[PDB]
Design a protein around this ligand. Structure first.
Ligand SMILES: Nc1ncnc2c1ncn2[C@@H]1O[C@H](COP(=O)(O)OP(=O)(O)OP(=O)(O)O)[C@@H](O)[C@H]1O
Ligand SMILES: Nc1ncnc2c1ncn2[C@@H]1O[C@H](COP(=O)(O)OP(=O)(O)OP(=O)(O)O)[C@@H](O)[C@H]1O
Ligand SMILES: [Mg+2]
Ligand SMILES: [Mg+2]
Lengths: 323, 323
């Protein structure tokens, strides 16, 4: 297809021109094996070995025996594993520095509380500002010309995270299905008290993902909590356990609304219990956030794990520069 | 005591002076038999036979064999029964006229919806106005400079009564404990989603009334729903069944908050299922309302039945301005 032109353009000059020809054949056919491999070898020329590996891994899900994809994948498979371990070791060092401090830190922890709420509600379309959120939570008075539902989403997030820190973070034992339901009972209670802390009774759609049928959610959630308390999950890096825990819940999509908000809270329950600070996926990252969750449905969870790992590093880089 | 002066003042002139004089010995001792009886004879001179009968009935709970109380009560007792039946027959006739009408009536039914909400919340101290309530429910936008809890009280009342008319009024069958919990789940859900639709876990005080202990609320409520579906309750006048239904739920006091709001809604479920319109206890009546409930704890529930009967007549008188 236009892949033949992408190669011709790349053959002597035209790097930025060739980049668009590759994406065009990818838009016109996202399972075009030859375009994925070639794009893979192309992005490796710009030192983007992680993207190249995604492309060879993607091309081998379509055609498992493709010789040009296999030869490059076998090389890059262990290299990307090393590259990803190194990033998690950087994150571990920044967590040591942050967990080796106080009063100057307390001013950041207070600022991040409202800033967390602001992004977790804004990532779903809530129009309230940080200043309007501070008013709602400090004063307990309503903000003019903004809906009551938007302001109740804020009261719920505050209540949910107050319950987690009060009842769940410093608790000894296994995470139950009832703990997930208690978080959701507060996240959504002030908005929809009938559905809050109760599973989906209907079948829905999330982008292009069709989650399990309501008849299967309870069996799928008992399998999820087993996994949270499983020895395999305890041996994973806390950043990887937190990201997978988020993805599996958001995959199950057990509630009508508040699944991303609950998942983002559960994700932070994990991190905090492992000594990491709570992280925040900013409202500007919705496009990336949704792309890497879609990528995980397609077959590759790694881009979402790296997405969470970059979110944790920016959180740690905020606590370290304000010290 | 000062009862001897109350009698001396009444003996030749001083009617208004002996009234405050009679109430002093009642404040100084509310179980003073002679005082109650003299007072009963006294209030009967002003043609207040219902109050006199309350006083002789009160005096005979203290001293069952008091000859002056017995002679006067054996007389008032069937007379008050006749007087109370006559009022319930007036109410029955006004209900026929109201249920024999349209467009001029529809103008009142819409106005009374926001009016019941305004009074059911205002009676508990809610500062929102009728105009602010119309905005909250019509627009779904918050009212400036008024708390979010006050506005969530309104969203809950609306949701609760929307559920009753939609799911309970025109339903065939027995009233269950779950129907009471579903009304309370909406009444309080937007304010307190953790306690909404859930019984009291602690022992509380309501004025001077100590309701049942949390261990006994479930047994006390199963006895309460049995009575709602009992043949004895079906044979009572709907005004008397509605008033007793209210008093029994509020005596039990099964929830931490929202008991009076739920009881007033249940009271109107009863009336509406019997063809009566929904009634509204106005915010100005909180003092009387609580006095008659205090009297029902003290032994006589007739003053509360008459209170509800006067509330139903004012509701019917309003609807009858259409003819
Ligand atoms: N393709 C996908 N597969 C699975 N989950 C997805 C996918 N795309 C998005 N999601 C997740 O679904 C969430 C949206 O679900 P939901 O409306 O129930 O809750 P939410 O708390 O309002 O989330 P948000 O505030 O981000 O919109 C997103 O936040 C995201 O985490
Ligand atoms: N002495 C009393 N004995 C029994 N019940 C009482 C007494 N005084 C008040 N009550 C009832 O208890 C209710 C108050 O309880 P509660 O706070 O749980 O409910 P509420 O919905 O907030 O009612 P309110 O709007 O009157 O404050 C009153 O509405 C009344 O019906
Ligand atoms: Mg949503
Ligand atoms: Mg109250």
């Amino acid at each position: 297809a236009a892949l033949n032109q992408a190669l011709e353009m790349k053959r002597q000059g035209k790097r930025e021109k060739a980049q668009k020809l590759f994406m065009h054949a990818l838009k016109m056919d996202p399972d075009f094996v030859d375009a994925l491999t070639e794009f893979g070898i192309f992005s490796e020329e710009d030192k983007d070995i992680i993207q190249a590996d995604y492309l060879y891994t993607r091309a081998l899900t379509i055609s498992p025996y493709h010789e040009k994809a296999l030869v490059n994948r076998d090389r890059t498979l262990p290299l990307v594993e090393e590259i990803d371990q190194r990033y998690f070791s950087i994150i571990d060092s920044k967590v040591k520095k942050v967990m080796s401090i106080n009063s100057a830190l307390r001013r950041v922890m207070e600022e991040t509380y409202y800033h967390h709420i602001y992004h977790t509600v804004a990532i779903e379309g809530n129009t309230l500002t940080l200043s309007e959120i501070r008013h709602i939570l400090e004063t307990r008075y309503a903000v003019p010309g903004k809906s009551l539902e938007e302001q109740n989403e804020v009261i719920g997030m505050h209540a949910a995270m107050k319950y987690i820190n009060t009842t769940l973070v410093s608790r000894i034992g296994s995470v139950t299905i009832s703990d997930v339901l208690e978080i959701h009972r507060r996240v959504l209670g002030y908005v929809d008290p009938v559905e809050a802390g109760r599973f989906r009774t209907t079948q829905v759609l999330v982008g292009h993902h069709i989650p399990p049928h309501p008849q299967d959610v309870e069996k799928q959630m008992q399998e999820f909590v087993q996994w949270l308390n499983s020895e395999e999950a305890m041996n994973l890096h806390p950043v990887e356990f937190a990201a997978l825990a988020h993805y599996k819940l958001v995959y199950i999509h057990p509630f009508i609304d508040g699944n991303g908000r609950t998942s983002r809270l559960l994700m932070n329950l994990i991190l905090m219990q492992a000594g990491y600070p709570p992280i925040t996926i900013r409202k500007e990252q919705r496009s990336d956030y949704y792309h890497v969750l879609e990528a995980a449905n397609e077959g590759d969870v790694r881009p979402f794990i790296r997405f969470i790992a970059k979110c944790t590093e920016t959180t740690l880089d905020t606590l370290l520069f304000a010290t």
